[PDB]
Design a protein around this ligand. Sequence first.
Ligand SMILES: N#Cc1ccc(Cn2cncc2CN2CCN(c3cccc(Cl)c3)C(=O)C2)cc1
Ligand SMILES: CC(C)=CCC/C(C)=C/CC/C(C)=C/COP(=O)(O)OP(=O)(O)O
Ligand SMILES: OC[C@H]1O[C@@](CO)(O[C@H]2O[C@H](CO)[C@@H](O)[C@H](O)[C@H]2O)[C@@H](O)[C@@H]1O
Ligand SMILES: OC[C@H]1O[C@@](CO)(O[C@H]2O[C@H](CO)[C@@H](O)[C@H](O)[C@H]2O)[C@@H](O)[C@@H]1O
Ligand SMILES: OC[C@H]1O[C@@](CO)(O[C@H]2O[C@H](CO)[C@@H](O)[C@H](O)[C@H]2O)[C@@H](O)[C@@H]1O
Ligand SMILES: O=S(=O)(O)C[C@H](O)CNC1CCCCC1
Ligand SMILES: O=S(=O)(O)C[C@H](O)CNC1CCCCC1
Ligand SMILES: O=S(=O)(O)C[C@H](O)CNC1CCCCC1
Ligand SMILES: [Zn+2]
Lengths: 315, 485
Amino acid sequence: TYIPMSQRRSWADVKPIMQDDGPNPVVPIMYSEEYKDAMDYFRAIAAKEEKSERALELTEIIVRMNPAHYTVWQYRFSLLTSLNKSLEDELRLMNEFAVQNLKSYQVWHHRLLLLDRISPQDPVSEIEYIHGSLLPDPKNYHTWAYLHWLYSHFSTLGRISEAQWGSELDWCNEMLRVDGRNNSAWGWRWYLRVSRPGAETSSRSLQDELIYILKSIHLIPHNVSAWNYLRGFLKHFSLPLVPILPAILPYTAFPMPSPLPEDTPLPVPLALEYLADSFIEQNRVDDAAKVFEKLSSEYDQMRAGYWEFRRRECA
Amino acid sequence: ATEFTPSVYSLVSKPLPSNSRPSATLDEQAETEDLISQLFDLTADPNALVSEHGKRYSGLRKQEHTQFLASSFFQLPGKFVSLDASRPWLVFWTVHSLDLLGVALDQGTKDRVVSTLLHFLSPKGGFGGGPANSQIPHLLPTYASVCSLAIAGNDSSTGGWKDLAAARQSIYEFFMRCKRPDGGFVVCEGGEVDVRGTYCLLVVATLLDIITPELLHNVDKFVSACQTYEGGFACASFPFPEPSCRVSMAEAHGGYTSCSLNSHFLLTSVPLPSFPLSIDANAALRWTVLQQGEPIEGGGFRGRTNKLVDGCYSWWVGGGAPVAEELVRREKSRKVIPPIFNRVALQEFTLVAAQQDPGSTGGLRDKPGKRPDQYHTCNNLSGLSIAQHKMSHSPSTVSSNRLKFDASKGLPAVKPVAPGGGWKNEDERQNARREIWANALGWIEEEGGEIIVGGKDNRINTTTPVFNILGLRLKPFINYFYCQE
Ligand SMILES: N#Cc1ccc(Cn2cncc2CN2CCN(c3cccc(Cl)c3)C(=O)C2)cc1
Ligand SMILES: CC(C)=CCC/C(C)=C/CC/C(C)=C/COP(=O)(O)OP(=O)(O)O
Ligand SMILES: OC[C@H]1O[C@@](CO)(O[C@H]2O[C@H](CO)[C@@H](O)[C@H](O)[C@H]2O)[C@@H](O)[C@@H]1O
Ligand SMILES: OC[C@H]1O[C@@](CO)(O[C@H]2O[C@H](CO)[C@@H](O)[C@H](O)[C@H]2O)[C@@H](O)[C@@H]1O
Ligand SMILES: OC[C@H]1O[C@@](CO)(O[C@H]2O[C@H](CO)[C@@H](O)[C@H](O)[C@H]2O)[C@@H](O)[C@@H]1O
Ligand SMILES: O=S(=O)(O)C[C@H](O)CNC1CCCCC1
Ligand SMILES: O=S(=O)(O)C[C@H](O)CNC1CCCCC1
Ligand SMILES: O=S(=O)(O)C[C@H](O)CNC1CCCCC1
Ligand SMILES: [Zn+2]
């Protein structure tokens, strides 16, 4: 049975404050006895701006019931800094939250704030945790965004070694080996290989990247992730499409296509987009328009309107 | 009108090819393809004259959806505590859906909506996810509350619009407290930084006439750098050490692409020099159209590459299409008509797959197998509206707006945080007021552009791109704050 906080001697000095909903509010929630009681006392605690251990304990009670309660999370971090609490211990609690399936924008942001403040000299153990946390949830958007932040923030502090970057690429390669259709991992590859300030982008480095991309395409010809990466790569480095065309041409009917893998019906819509864009590069607008028309009427009819727009843009 | 928008039923439905490489992504995809295609097979083609015998009827069950929204509008069970910090969204999702469904609230109920939301307003500025004595202000419920007040409020003493006008300075100050030097905003004190915050802030600032140069500095650069190699936009960009370079921090997503395109569009009507920093509109358009699913997955939109189709992205991705289209149009005109997405297929996804099965709770949903909710009800319907009605931003309408604008009418100018943070002079401020107001009211329903799949009984009202409220709500609301009534 639940013991009301008004009956607890630890809270006797606190006068709870009721929720100020006003008369007959819309969308009211029938709060549980526990949640209402906790919020009544939090309202009082926060109004008086008490920074104490009981206030800290109370914030944990509330966020367990509602992980998205941003006000309480804001108050919790203020409590951690005011009381000079062990932030490493708090990180361990956040790990437990993930295991207990308690998640939100707020939990991930709280984690960011903790790592920012702890500011470890080597963030390897946190990087390792994040990798492990992606196993049951390989596409969790918050986790991927956090990983980007972690490497970005700590690299500005000069705290990411070349060995650390190397193992990160190794890990990303394994993720893409496990699931080549994981677009989140492709996005992480782009950061590691293209967009990050320290990315190695020499002539031979671009050659190696092209090889990797094409081999990914030849392995999974219908993988939209791989095609978007190819097109993004050539566009970013202002590389002509024509010299790579022999590797893509078989999908419209450097590493070349495999007999093609089984269950690979032709043509691949994005291979046709490539072919059409290569015609535009050659100033062959009529040939380009012909491909867009085929995409519109036969090979990618869902986007009939869009491909017609691209066709008209040639004429 | 439908030449380039083939019906799902007129196309061949085949699974996404495996290329003989199985993966977790494909396992989920094939399973979802099965769920959606099987429901399409059980449902009568909405376009057919002879609605075949024994098959489920796909008509929009407006009354079921009205009952769904009504049954949770006045009381929510204890489990909804997960959305206690999102109660203004529960308000917005309901009142906007009812607007779209053409269901009027009586004045008494409207007054309750106003009262509920006004108690969420802090004197220091901004709305929170609950009462001011319970929750701190936050950019997202500020958007949700402001839009809800546009929908349910009025210009009388009990209508709430008066309260917003008085709160203009404090709301502006809250916005400035959220501002970071790189152009990002925290969603709340000590909160996360992403383009949802930027979008929600820019909508409210536009509507209430509280835009200044200091509020917008670097905001364009932050958003522009969210664009990924895929063409869509990520949650945020990281400023590398004024900054040497800005880098996108995750995948292009429908939600963040919606917020980014809309944010950028709002910024284009602010006449600051070399502002806003350009985005790649064609890449954004390409990404948008590529997220429309194949016939087997019902022509609904997915939120990101190699993920699943979901009814809510009809608004987030579909509703970004007319914005991207307009930006592409402007760019081609700067250097120097068929629909750009399958408007028919999207309506078919909504009618066939996104509605709750008949004779039950009602409401609209993510996909078959998922419980309907308020969030999906609102976003399915908002997306359906975009598909049904051809919305365009009209330069001639904007020109007509400019001609009727009265600069001598307006509320007191906000006092900037920094002495030089305001407009250079009154002429430049008034020119900005005119541009912001004229462009905000530039969206028109194209004559002859209407396509209502399944017949006119399926027609819902026309939402406005960028803002996502009805034009009939937007006009008197913005006119009130700019004193253009
Ligand atoms: N924000 C956000 C968000 C995050 C993830 C998603 C992904 N998504 C897609 N379909 C369902 C979802 C899960 N969403 C439901 C709505 N929602 C929410 C709550 C309060 C307000 C708003 Cl607008 C939205 C969430 O936070 C989580 C969608 C939206
Ligand atoms: C104005 C405002 C508040 C806009 C928000 C827009 C929006 C829909 C954002 C989604 C953000 C996000 C982390 C999605 C991933 O969720 P998921 O992995 O559950 O969904 P997924 O599989 O479709 O990507
Ligand atoms: O977290 C408490 C801590 O934050 C501050 C500002 O840094 O106040 C914020 O939190 C209070 C409790 O929720 C609110 O009343 C206030 O509006 C908000 O700014 C500090 O004053 C407080 O110690
Ligand atoms: O078999 C491929 C061939 O069929 C078409 C339609 O005639 O596309 C169908 O099959 C594709 C899978 O290979 C699906 O992606 C698509 O949704 C479906 O219509 C042609 O477009 C394609 O060339
Ligand atoms: O399509 C234009 C216009 O025609 C109407 C009837 O006036 O519906 C017809 O067209 C729809 C879309 O092509 C079909 O789904 C429907 O079966 C057919 O009657 C209007 O609803 C529509 O706006
Ligand atoms: O929301 S809708 O599906 O459009 C409308 C509801 O199904 C109501 N259907 C009634 C059943 C009994 C006879 C009168 C009609
Ligand atoms: O000064 S104002 O902002 O107008 C009014 C107070 O600050 C409100 N503080 C609340 C205390 C309880 C938790 C949520 C915040
Ligand atoms: O206005 S039109 O599009 O020509 C035709 C009507 O909208 C058809 N609506 C149906 C009426 C009978 C019950 C099921 C809906
Ligand atoms: Zn959804």
